[PDB]
Design a protein around this ligand. Structure first.
Ligand SMILES: COc1ccc([C@]2(c3cccc(-c4cccnc4)c3)N=C(N)N(C)C2=O)cc1C
Length: 367
């Protein structure tokens, strides 16, 4: 049942959400980043200064060598093999999955994140070294009776060390206790990343009035493995302009808007009401319909009372990252090629919202 998967996610603000997994026999316990923005099960498999433990293939009786390497510059590299994998607070199953045993890496692992690997939940098209390497979830679905869908409730922190965050990854279904109101769905435009289409953007109800192709230039994706809302240059600039104006009563250093520095108010004085809400309208399942997800400053200002601006520029399209997902229960409905959003169960004047339908075309940035 899904209840045993509730709160199966932990993390530190800004360092991703991880789920406990085991690999090999006997089970080796590891914390693994839940990442909808990639498609490899890649796990630290050799000593590293940021790793307090790692996957030891030699300790595993069930390890099988694929005698093939993988090199991922962007870096990390490893050796492909398969082994038995389980998620202790997930489905009660064990699957033989591809594992990229990371033997060397540079600026991949995060100091103090408390995770030792990544669970790439996106599609084979973007698996490394190529689409022949079946992703974990594909293996899980093919080998078990787990429904071809998962959902994420990322809860963030809320009110010396980075704030601890929590959440739930529900594998194989939708846990109604994790959300309120209606689930609205936007199509997965193509199965590689979880690519979606944004058709309109508003800041405090004010339309940015851009050609919608701009919102999806050159793609828009939903990525738990990204902290911020990342926006294409033109959209980021229009958004920041609008947010600045909305919060004009209080002026901040441009270093804050650039996501560099933190703004501080002493405990409990943060003027949330000065910052605007942001509404992303996503293409509906029905051609000329859309719906909006509305996020509060409590989502896009992330605690480090000090905060960093969690909206940042992208040259690879829109990325609806953790701070966006944190307002919502997000359903990755792979079976029906669609992604659902609803208000998550996790101030007194505003609330994150999911609302539709709203009236409209050709917003996709073809490829
Ligand atoms: C197959 O190779 C992969 C796999 C995953 C990733 C990353 C990744 C890698 C390491 C750490 C994080 C990370 C850091 C902080 C917060 N939250 C995720 C993300 N996951 C995504 N979504 N992103 C955009 C990435 O950079 C990168 C590469 C190159």
């Amino acid at each position: 049942s899904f209840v045993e998967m509730v709160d199966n996610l932990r993390g530190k603000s800004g360092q991703g959400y991880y789920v406990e997994m085991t690999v090999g026999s006997p089970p080796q316990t590891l914390n693994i980043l839940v990442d909808t923005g990639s498609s490899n099960f890649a796990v630290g498999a050799a000593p590293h200064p940021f790793l307090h433990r790692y996957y030891q293939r030699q300790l595993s009786s069930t390890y099988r060598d694929l005698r093939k390497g993988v090199y991922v510059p962007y870096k990390w590299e490893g050796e492909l093999g398969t082994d038995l994998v389980s998620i202790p607070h997930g489905p009660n199953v064990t699957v033989r999955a591809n594992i990229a045993a990371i033997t060397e890496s540079d600026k991949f692992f995060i100091n103090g994140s408390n995770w030792e690997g990544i669970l790439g939940l996106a599609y084979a098209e973007i698996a490394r070294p190529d689409d022949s390497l079946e992703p974990f979830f594909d293996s899980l679905v093919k080998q078990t009776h787990v429904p071809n869908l998962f959902s994420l409730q990322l809860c963030g922190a809320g009110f010396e060390v980075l704030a601890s965050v929590g959440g739930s990854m529900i594998i194989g279904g939708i846990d109604h206790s994790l959300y309120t109101g209606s689930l609205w769905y936007t199509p997965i435009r193509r199965e590689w990343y979880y690519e979606v289409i944004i058709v309109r953007v508003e800041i405090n109800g004010q339309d940015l009035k851009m050609d919608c192709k701009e919102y999806n230039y050159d793609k828009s994706i939903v990525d738990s493995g990204t902290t911020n809302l990342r926006l294409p240059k033109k959209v980021f600039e229009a958004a920041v302009k609008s947010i600045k104006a909305a919060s004009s009563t209080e002026k901040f250093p441009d270093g804050f808007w650039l996501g560099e520095q933190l703004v501080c108010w002493q405990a409990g004085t943060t003027p949330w009401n000065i910052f605007p809400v942001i509404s992303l309208y996503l293409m509906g399942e029905v051609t000329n319909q859309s719906f909006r997800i509305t996020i509060l400053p409590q989502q896009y200002l992330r605690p480090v009372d000090c905060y960093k601006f969690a909206i940042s520029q992208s040259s690879t399209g829109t990325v609806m990252g953790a701070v966006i997902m944190e307002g919502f229960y997000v359903v990755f409905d792979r079976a029906r090629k669609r992604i659902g959003f609803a208000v998550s169960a996790c101030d007194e004047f505003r609330t994150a919202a999911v609302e539709g339908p709203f009236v409209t075309e050709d917003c996709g940035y073809n490829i």
